[PDB]
Structure formats: C-alpha cells, structure tokens
C-alpha cells in the first residue's frame, strides 16, 4: 500500500505521437502509428500487405 509514483508541481507533459500537451501516448486519441494502414496489424508497411493466406 502506498506504493507512490509520481508527485511535483509545475509537472511537464508532452506526446511523443502528435506533439501537443497534457497527455501521453497511452492516453492520446491520434491515428495509431507503427502499423499497417490497410489492414491495422503492426509491423509492416501496407505495401507488404500482400492477399492473406488461407486460415
Ligand atoms: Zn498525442
Ligand atoms: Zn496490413
């Protein structure tokens, strides 16, 4: 109990993904980067996306 984790005043928050304060990554609402465009499963370029296979 009383684990902690964060407290100071004047705290800075910035987002890594669109720039802009008062979030994080987690918590933003932007498009989802690092992933395919075309199917949304992440590690490839949707370029790569090529036809699925059967099951
Ligand atoms: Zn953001
Ligand atoms: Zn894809």
């Known amino acids: 109990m009383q684990r ?13 993904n669109c720039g802009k304060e008062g979030h994080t990554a987690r918590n933003c ?12 499963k992440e590690g490839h370029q949707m370029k790569d996306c090529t036809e699925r296979q059967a099951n």
Do not use: D, H, L, S
């Open 4 to 16: 902690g984790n964060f407290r100071n005043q004047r705290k800075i928050v910035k987002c890594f």
């Open 29 to 40: 609402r932007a498009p989802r980067k690092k992933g395919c465009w075309k199917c949304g």
